[PDB]
Every structure is written in C-alpha cells, then in structure tokens.
Amino acid sequence: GSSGSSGGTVLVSIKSSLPENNFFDDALIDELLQQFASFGEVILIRFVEDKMWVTFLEGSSALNVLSLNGKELLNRTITIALKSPSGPSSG
C-alpha cells in the first residue's frame, strides 16, 4: 500500500536452495521479460547484489505487474515487491 513514486523500479527475488543459485540466469530473466510484458513493457533491468530490480516504462505499469507477486516460474518461486521510500514523501 504505497501511492506516489516518480519512477518504476520493482524488486524481484527467486527462492532457491543453494546460495550460488540466487543469481538470475538467461532463462529466469528472458522468461520474466515476457511475463512482465503481459502488463508492462520492460525497458531497463538492474541486478542487485542478491536481489533483482526491474524498471518499467512508467510507475503505474509497475503497479500492474504486481500480479506476478509470488508467481512461480522455472521451478523457482519469484517474489515481487515495490521499492518503498525510506524517507518521507513530503519535504
């Protein structure tokens, strides 16, 4: 539950067993792209130390893709989550 955000960066993680598997491969990504297309047309993708961020054309689009929150793909449970603002919105 968060409204207001100038951007469109969403966090995406995959549930695995080994610590050297948390890394996203060509399949996990390639496949994801399409899945995200169903709602928003991905434009930029940023890989985090352990997490995986994904940018979208607009912020709203990143709100629709949330429908993939938890969706399991390639025998790998994916968990999507918006990037909550650490600091207050007002100024």
From Swiss-Prot:
Residues 16-85 form the RRM domain. Signal peptide: none annotated. It is found in: Cytoplasm, Perinuclear region. Transmembrane segments: none annotated. It is linked to Parkinson disease 20, early-onset: An early-onset form of Parkinson disease, a complex neurodegenerative disorder characterized by bradykinesia, resting tremor, muscular rigidity and postural instability, as well as by a clinically significant response to treatment with levodopa. The pathology involves the loss of dopaminergic neurons in the substantia nigra and the presence of Lewy bodies (intraneuronal accumulations of aggregated proteins), in surviving neurons in various areas of the brain. PARK20 is characterized by young adult-onset of parkinsonism. Developmental and epileptic encephalopathy 53: A form of epileptic encephalopathy, a heterogeneous group of severe early-onset epilepsies characterized by refractory seizures, neurodevelopmental impairment, and poor prognosis. Development is normal prior to seizure onset, after which cognitive and motor delays become apparent. DEE53 inheritance is autosomal recessive. Belongs to the synaptojanin family. In the central section; belongs to the inositol 1,4,5-trisphosphate 5-phosphatase family. Phosphatase that acts on various phosphoinositides, including phosphatidylinositol 4-phosphate, phosphatidylinositol (4,5)-bisphosphate and phosphatidylinositol (3,4,5)-trisphosphate. Has a role in clathrin-mediated endocytosis. Hydrolyzes PIP2 bound to actin regulatory proteins resulting in the rearrangement of actin filaments downstream of tyrosine kinase and ASH/GRB2. Interacts with EPS15 (a clathrin coat-associated protein) via a C-terminal domain containing three Asn-Pro-Phe (NPF) repeats. Interacts with ASH/GRB2. Interacts with PACSIN1, PACSIN2 and PACSIN3. Interacts with AMPH, SH3GL1, SH3GL2 and SH3GL3. Interacts with MYO1E (via SH3 domain). Interacts with BIN1 and DNM1. Interacts with EPS15. This is Synaptojanin-1. It comes from Homo sapiens (Human). The chain holds residues 894 to 971 of 1573 of the full protein.
